[PDB]
Amino acid sequence: KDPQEILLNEAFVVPYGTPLSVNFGPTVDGDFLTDMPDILLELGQFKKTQILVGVNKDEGTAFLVYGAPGFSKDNNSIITRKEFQEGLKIFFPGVSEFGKESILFHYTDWVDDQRPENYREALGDVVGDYNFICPALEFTKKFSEWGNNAFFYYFEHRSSKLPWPEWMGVMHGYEIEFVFGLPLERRDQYTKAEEILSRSIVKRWANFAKYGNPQETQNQSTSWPVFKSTEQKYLTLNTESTRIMTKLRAQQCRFWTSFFPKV
Amino acid sequence: KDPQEILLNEAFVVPYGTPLSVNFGPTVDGDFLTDMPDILLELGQFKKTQILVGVNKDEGTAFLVYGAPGFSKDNNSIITRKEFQEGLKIFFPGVSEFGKESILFHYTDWVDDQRPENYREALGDVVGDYNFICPALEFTKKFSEWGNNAFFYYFEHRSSKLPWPEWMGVMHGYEIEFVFGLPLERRDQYTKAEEILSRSIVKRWANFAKYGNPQETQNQSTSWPVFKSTEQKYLTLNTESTRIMTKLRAQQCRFWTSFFPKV
Amino acid sequence: KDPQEILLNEAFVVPYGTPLSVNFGPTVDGDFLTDMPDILLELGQFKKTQILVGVNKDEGTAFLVYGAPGFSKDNNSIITRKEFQEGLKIFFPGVSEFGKESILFHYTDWVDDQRPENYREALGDVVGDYNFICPALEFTKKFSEWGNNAFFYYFEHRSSKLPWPEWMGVMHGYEIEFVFGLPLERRDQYTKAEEILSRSIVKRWANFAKYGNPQETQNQSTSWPVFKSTEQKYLTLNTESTRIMTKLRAQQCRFWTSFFPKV
Ligand SMILES: *[C@@H]1O[C@H](CO[C@H]2O[C@@H](C)[C@@H](O)[C@@H](O)[C@@H]2O)[C@@H](O[C@@H]2O[C@H](CO)[C@@H](O)[C@H](O)[C@H]2NC(C)=O)[C@H](O)[C@H]1NC(C)=O
Ligand SMILES: *[C@@H]1O[C@H](CO[C@H]2O[C@@H](C)[C@@H](O)[C@@H](O)[C@@H]2O)[C@@H](O[C@@H]2O[C@H](CO)[C@@H](O)[C@H](O)[C@H]2NC(C)=O)[C@H](O)[C@H]1NC(C)=O
Ligand SMILES: *[C@@H]1O[C@H](CO[C@H]2O[C@@H](C)[C@@H](O)[C@@H](O)[C@@H]2O)[C@@H](O[C@@H]2O[C@H](CO)[C@@H](O)[C@H](O)[C@H]2NC(C)=O)[C@H](O)[C@H]1NC(C)=O
Ligand SMILES: *[C@H]1O[C@H](CO[C@H]2O[C@@H](C)[C@@H](O)[C@@H](O)[C@@H]2O)[C@@H](O[C@@H]2O[C@H](CO)[C@@H](O)[C@H](O)[C@H]2NC(C)=O)[C@H](O)[C@H]1NC(C)=O
Ligand SMILES: *[C@H]1O[C@H](CO[C@H]2O[C@@H](C)[C@@H](O)[C@@H](O)[C@@H]2O)[C@@H](O[C@@H]2O[C@H](CO)[C@@H](O)[C@H](O)[C@H]2NC(C)=O)[C@H](O)[C@H]1NC(C)=O
Ligand SMILES: *[C@H]1O[C@H](CO[C@H]2O[C@@H](C)[C@@H](O)[C@@H](O)[C@@H]2O)[C@@H](O[C@@H]2O[C@H](CO)[C@@H](O)[C@H](O)[C@H]2NC(C)=O)[C@H](O)[C@H]1NC(C)=O
Ligand SMILES: *[C@@H]1O[C@H](CO)[C@@H](O)[C@H](O)[C@H]1NC(C)=O
Ligand SMILES: *[C@@H]1O[C@H](CO)[C@@H](O)[C@H](O)[C@H]1NC(C)=O
Ligand SMILES: *[C@@H]1O[C@H](CO)[C@@H](O)[C@H](O)[C@H]1NC(C)=O
Ligand SMILES: [Cl-]
Ligand SMILES: [Cl-]
Ligand SMILES: [Cl-]
Ligand SMILES: [Cl-]
Ligand SMILES: [Cl-]
Ligand SMILES: [Cl-]
Ligand SMILES: [K+]
Numbered sequence: 001k002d003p004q005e006i007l008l009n010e011a012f013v014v015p016y017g018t019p020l021s022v023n024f025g026p027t028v029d030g031d032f033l034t035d036m037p038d039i040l041l042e043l044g045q046f047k048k049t050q051i052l053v054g055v056n057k058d059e060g061t062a063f064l065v066y067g068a069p070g071f072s073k074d075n076n077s078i079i080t081r082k083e084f085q086e087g088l089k090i091f092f093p094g095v096s097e098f099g100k101e102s103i104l105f106h107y108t109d110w111v112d113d114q115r116p117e118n119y120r121e122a123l124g125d126v127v128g129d130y131n132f133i134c135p136a137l138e139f140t141k142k143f144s145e146w147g148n149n150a151f152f153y154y155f156e157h158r159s160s161k162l163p164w165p166e167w168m169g170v171m172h173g174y175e176i177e178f179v180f181g182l183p184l185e186r187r188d189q190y191t192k193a194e195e196i197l198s199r200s201i202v203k204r205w206a207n208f209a210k211y212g213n214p215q216e217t218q219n220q221s222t223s224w225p226v227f228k229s230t231e232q233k234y235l236t237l238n239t240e241s242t243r244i245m246t247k248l249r250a251q252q253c254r255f256w257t258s259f260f261p262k263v
Numbered sequence: 264k265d266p267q268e269i270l271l272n273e274a275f276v277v278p279y280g281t282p283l284s285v286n287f288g289p290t291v292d293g294d295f296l297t298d299m300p301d302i303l304l305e306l307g308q309f310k311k312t313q314i315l316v317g318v319n320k321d322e323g324t325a326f327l328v329y330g331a332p333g334f335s336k337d338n339n340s341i342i343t344r345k346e347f348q349e350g351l352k353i354f355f356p357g358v359s360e361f362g363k364e365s366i367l368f369h370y371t372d373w374v375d376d377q378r379p380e381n382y383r384e385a386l387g388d389v390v391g392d393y394n395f396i397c398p399a400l401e402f403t404k405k406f407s408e409w410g411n412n413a414f415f416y417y418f419e420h421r422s423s424k425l426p427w428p429e430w431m432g433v434m435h436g437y438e439i440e441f442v443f444g445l446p447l448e449r450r451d452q453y454t455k456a457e458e459i460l461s462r463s464i465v466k467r468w469a470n471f472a473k474y475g476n477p478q479e480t481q482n483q484s485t486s487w488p489v490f491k492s493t494e495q496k497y498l499t500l501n502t503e504s505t506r507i508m509t510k511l512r513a514q515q516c517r518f519w520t521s522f523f524p525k526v
Numbered sequence: 527k528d529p530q531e532i533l534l535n536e537a538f539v540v541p542y543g544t545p546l547s548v549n550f551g552p553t554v555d556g557d558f559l560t561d562m563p564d565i566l567l568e569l570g571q572f573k574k575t576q577i578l579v580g581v582n583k584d585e586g587t588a589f590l591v592y593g594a595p596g597f598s599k600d601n602n603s604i605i606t607r608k609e610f611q612e613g614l615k616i617f618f619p620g621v622s623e624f625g626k627e628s629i630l631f632h633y634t635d636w637v638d639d640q641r642p643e644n645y646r647e648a649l650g651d652v653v654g655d656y657n658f659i660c661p662a663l664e665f666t667k668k669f670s671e672w673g674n675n676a677f678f679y680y681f682e683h684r685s686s687k688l689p690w691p692e693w694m695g696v697m698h699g700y701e702i703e704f705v706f707g708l709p710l711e712r713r714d715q716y717t718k719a720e721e722i723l724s725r726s727i728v729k730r731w732a733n734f735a736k737y738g739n740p741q742e743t744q745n746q747s748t749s750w751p752v753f754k755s756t757e758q759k760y761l762t763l764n765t766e767s768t769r770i771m772t773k774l775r776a777q778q779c780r781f782w783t784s785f786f787p788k789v
Contacts, residue, residue: 098364376717455640459638508771
């Protein structure tokens with residue numbers, strides 16, 4: 001077949017997909033991967049070394065404009081409860097009615113005013129917690145229980161140049177340009193606070209690669225503590241002040257990690 | 264009013280009740296009880312002393328014949344899924360559809376053959392775990408976290424004289440006659456194994472009252488360990504062999520204690 | 527000599543044997559085995575690695591029908607005290623009168639009714655505790671005191687196809703077919719509960735071989751804890767529910783391990 005005929009048919013090998021569908025991805029082949037990876041992780045069968053893991057504050061928002069009803073990058077995407085419900089059918093298509101109601105139960109008990117954006121925000125958090133944040137935190141817990149140093153970050157700076165609208169917040173993919181040092185180029189109209197943030201992240205990442213320890217040692221920086229089971233310390237990355245916090249998304253992750261897999 | 268007019272109307276002060284309805288019971292009166300008792304328990308505001316707490320293996324079965332459809336003391340009460348569902352509506356009348364589906368989800372994932380009695384047993388366990396066993400275990404955990412010795416038992420002997428049918432098992436109320444020593448009377452046709460069981464329970468209860476420690480010290484008995492948070496050791500009471508076990512109904516109680524109150 | 531003449535004479539090289547006689551077995555040869563193996567075990571002179579060890583609930587019953595008087599696979603084998611006594615002479619032929627009375631003393635203090643099967647059961651337990659269970663537990667204790675992980679199981683499921691009679695219980699040899707996965711073959715008329723039990727044992731054994739840890743990680747299974755001196759946790763294997771228990775046959779093994787060797 002010509003490549004194009006293959007590419008044209010890939011979307012359709014599945015009876016329904018979502019904005020996050022991975023139709024052709026890694027499998028347990030008995031070669032690269034010798035067993036189901038959740039078993040290897042759980043029983044400590046992996047390279048023993050240091051890791052640096054993290055996520056962005058609004059991981060799930062980018063995906064909402066690729067099919068959730070009522071959402072648009074060109075307006076504030078205020079949706080109703082009915083829209084939120086239709087939105088869960090878009091992101092959880094093979095999932096039982098009970099499963100989808102369990103999501104709604106967990107994410108719509110509001111604190112508290114009748115804010116118009118309640119349902120818009122809840123959907124972005126559903127999608128980002130399920131697909132990115134709770135699995136990164138569980139991976140880091142399980143990895144670190146076998147004795148190696150791990151360091152977790154929560155990236156919470158929205159780029160001053162971001163071409164997507166404000167309601168999408170600190171989107172998935174938009175820490176990358178800070179990691180590779182693009183705001184170090186003054187000619188590019190990032191802010192001064194972003195130059196300093198990128199410079200500090202670049203130093204932490206290079207120190208982690210060179211020395212296994214993602215510190216910034218020269219500029220009275222917050223010290224980045226290892227992430228352990230029990231305390232679960234992580235470091236927030238932002239232009240204002242870096243903080244050590246604990247137990248990121250604790251109540252949400254208990255839902256996705258210990259209950260939802262049963263559904 | 265004459266007493267009879269009061270008694271006749273008590274059943275009806277509530278728009279629907281269940282076999283377990285307590286229409287007139289303890290309240291927070293600012294006198295006997297100075298605050299909501301869950302607050303006092305949680306914050307350690309109670310008499311500091313030893314406690315002995317326990318439950319019977321089939322606490323919920325006695326209640327099923329007072330209104331769950333398909334149940335009868337005069338047949339084996341095999342029910343269907345539909346009956347099980349109607350049964351939850353009888354025992355959880357003010358509870359949302361989602362709440363009742365959550366019960367069914369948690370109790371009907373079977374291990375495993377298509378046993379006819381699956382749903383009959385699941386209903387007795389729902390009712391006994393929610394109303395008796397998980398709350399006794401939570402009370403004992405919370406009490407013991409403030410530093411006092413607590414001892415938990417699981418009573419699992421069905422009286423040889425029990426006039427209710429076999430499917431009801433080790434029913435609610437039927438440890439009482441062992442505690443008060445009725446099987447010590449040989450004229451009454453309990454078995455010899457029941458005489459010995461009652462004699463040992465009577466000694467443990469009297470030792471607990473006299474000395475704060477419910478041991479039977481003279482007859483090479485299993486030593487009854489204190490119940491602590493963390494290990495949650497309890498002692499099984501039966502005619503065959505007494506065992507030390509841990510974490511009674513762990514998976515079920517996590518459901519009733521940490522999830523169900525939200526529903 | 528022709529092989530047959532050798533085989534014909536093997537039974538007779540010993541002045542009396544028992545159903546468990548090993549007339550030609552391992553010896554201390556100064557080659558395969560460099561010293562008495564109890565010395566090597568006691569002083570830690572063995573390969574340092576993980577072990578998985580376990581026993582079946584009724585190890586000794588299979589042997590009773592190969593010579594104990596009153597026993598038969600074709601009836602319920604209720605025996606008398608005199609039969610029990612003759613039975614000890616069959617299984618402990620070189621042992622002093624005092625030694626045999628010590629066995630009877632330890633196993634016949636009954637709890638408690640005058641059950642007809644008291645002596646039948648006591649004999650199966652004598653033979654299974656002395657020959658299999660207490661030595662497996664002592665081996666596992668002594669091995670694990672030198673620092674390696676060990677996991678102990680107690681197998682308590684009687685195969686639905688077992689052609690021996692009910693009184694023999696969970697016999698010696700009858701876990702093997704669960705380990706090798708024979709109940710996975712639906713065409714063979716094991717029950718559904720046995721298919722699931724075998725599937726779980728097969729996974730635990732393969733995980734132990736591959737990873738040194740006999741967990742079943744995917745199906746909310748009971749976690750199998752290491753067996754340590756002090757706590758002596760073991761895992762029960764059955765079709766109903768898997769339990770973590772402690773100190774298997776504690777009172778019996780103290781008899782066989784610390785007293786009987788003196789006799
Ligand atoms: C924000 O936009 C969405 C997206 O749809 C629209 O894009 C707009 C910016 C505008 O150009 C509009 O014409 C275009 O259709 C609106 O949702 C849509 O609403 C329409 C019209 O009512 C529905 O019939 C559509 O099915 C629905 N589209 C999708 C993909 O759901 C949305 O209402 C609007 N929200 C606002 C203004 O708050
Ligand atoms: C076990 O009994 C129940 C209870 O109802 C019955 O009590 C029986 C022992 C017998 O005397 C019967 O006539 C009496 O009604 C049975 O459930 C009942 O089934 C009937 C007839 O089909 C229904 O129409 C009833 O509504 C229902 N009663 C209740 C309270 O649910 C039940 O089927 C039976 N179960 C068995 C035999 O397994
Ligand atoms: C259960 O059987 C044993 C075994 O002996 C017998 O096998 C039976 C099923 C039957 O065919 C019987 O004829 C055969 O001998 C019984 O013990 C035997 O009892 C006999 C007759 O009284 C004694 O004289 C034998 O020596 C004795 N055999 C052995 C090996 O001990 C046994 O009594 C019987 N038990 C029951 C029925 O409870
Ligand atoms: C994988 O197997 C079938 C494949 O069915 C598919 O045919 C393909 C060539 C492709 O075009 C694909 O879109 C189409 O779905 C799946 O069967 C589907 O199941 C649905 C019900 O959900 C039925 O309606 C059809 O048989 C078929 N779908 C449609 C839209 O026609 C099957 O679901 C799948 N296996 C999985 C998901 O595990
Ligand atoms: C307590 O207040 C009312 C009381 O309504 C009741 O009138 C009583 C005298 C008594 O007979 C009782 O059985 C009757 O219910 C409750 O109002 C009920 O709510 C339902 C809907 O669930 C309506 O149908 C009625 O107003 C009434 N019930 C019936 C069966 O007619 C109210 O529910 C209750 N408060 C609670 C439960 O907190
Ligand atoms: C090993 O040495 C002798 C061997 O005596 C045996 O002669 C063999 C060829 C064989 O047939 C065997 O069955 C026979 O016993 C043992 O001597 C026995 O001791 C008993 C008393 O218990 C005497 O009666 C005999 O000398 C002989 N037995 C019989 C039945 O005739 C000796 O016991 C043994 N050593 C051990 C057990 O350590
Ligand atoms: C540290 O501070 C200096 C000057 O005070 C600055 O120029 C540099 O960017 C900082 N370095 C890092 C690694 O953040
Ligand atoms: C202890 O055992 C004796 C005799 O061995 C018995 O009569 C008595 O009932 C037992 N006592 C208790 C307190 O269980
Ligand atoms: C786990 O459960 C699945 C389905 O719920 C079942 O088919 C499989 O046999 C189980 N696996 C193991 C290893 O026990
Ligand atoms: Cl709704
Ligand atoms: Cl904390
Ligand atoms: Cl249904
Ligand atoms: Cl435990
Ligand atoms: Cl005697
Ligand atoms: Cl113990
Ligand atoms: K739930």
